[PDB]
């Protein structure tokens, strides 16, 4: 009969977020990165509101809720950006925000052209794999539950159950033919491979933003409060190996 989980994910999916970028100023490293940082700060508000509205999320210990959001935001935001880029510009450009679309020139000026190329490839995967909106939403929800401390969470048992349930929801919505069991298996394989592929991209961006925050005063790049806190307190836990992604495949 009529489900519920998908209804919820569709209902809570964040709307359009603008970066507040002044497209009159030249495309300088300082201007572009300061705008991406502000976009991050703005999107973080929406990620928190989204996560708190997810089925079961409030069952986690409050400190664990904070922790998973602070570790997973980069992956979540990149994955969502890849989808926007796919749907809006067929992955030709990176659609960070309606007022902050990166073309080749901006990719170069941002000094993260290589990372942008990887993000474009991620975006293109949505087309190559013909990912459905429902597959996208379930995959994105699972990204929230895909990075934790090596030492575990305060209530790891509840987390493990929640993650299991999100994996089950993804399995249920995969676009495949049940009459051909091999198709469903191949599809699930492809999707878990796609999910895993987000992590190395997020890692490169974690390294970049950390290095940027350290030199931010020297290169005139502004970091808002929440971003500067998370990049200085949580991101280094990832970079130092205290916090690691949960991969499907070895």
């Amino acid at each position: 009969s009529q489900p519920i989980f998908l209804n919820v994910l569709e209902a809570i999916e964040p709307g359009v977020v603008c970066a507040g970028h002044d497209n009159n100023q030249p495309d300088s490293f300082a201007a572009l990165l300061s705008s991406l940082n502000e976009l991050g700060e703005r999107q973080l508000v929406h990620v928190v509101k989204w996560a708190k509205a997810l089925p079961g999320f409030r069952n986690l210990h409050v400190d664990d809720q904070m922790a998973v959001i602070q570790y997973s935001w980069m992956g979540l935001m990149v994955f969502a950006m890849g989808w926007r880029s796919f749907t809006n510009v067929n992955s030709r450009m990176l659609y960070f925000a309606p007022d902050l679309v990166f073309n080749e020139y901006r990719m170069h000026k941002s000094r993260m052209y290589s990372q942008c190329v990887r993000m474009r490839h991620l975006s293109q995967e949505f087309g190559w794999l013909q990912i459905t909106p429902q597959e996208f939403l379930c995959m994105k929800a699972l990204l929230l539950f895909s990075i934790i401390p090596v030492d575990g969470l305060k209530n790891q048992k509840f987390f493990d159950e929640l993650r299991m349930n999100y994996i089950k929801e993804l399995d249920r919505i995969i676009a495949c033919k049940r009459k051909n069991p091999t198709s469903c298996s191949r599809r699930f394989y492809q999707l878990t491979k796609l999910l895993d592929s987000v992590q190395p991209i997020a890692r490169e961006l974690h390294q970049f933003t950390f290095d940027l925050l350290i030199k931010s005063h020297m290169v005139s790049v502004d970091f808002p409060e929440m971003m500067a806190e998370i990049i200085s307190v949580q991101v280094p836990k990832i970079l130092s190996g205290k916090v690691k992604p949960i991969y499907f495949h070895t």
């Binding site: 928190v48 809720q65 929440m226």
Partner: peptide, 12 residues
């Protein structure tokens, strides 16, 4: 940490 946790405390 203030603004971030504030987004969780508000209407918990």
């Amino acid at each position: 940490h203030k603004k971030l946790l504030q987004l969780l405390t508000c209407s918990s």
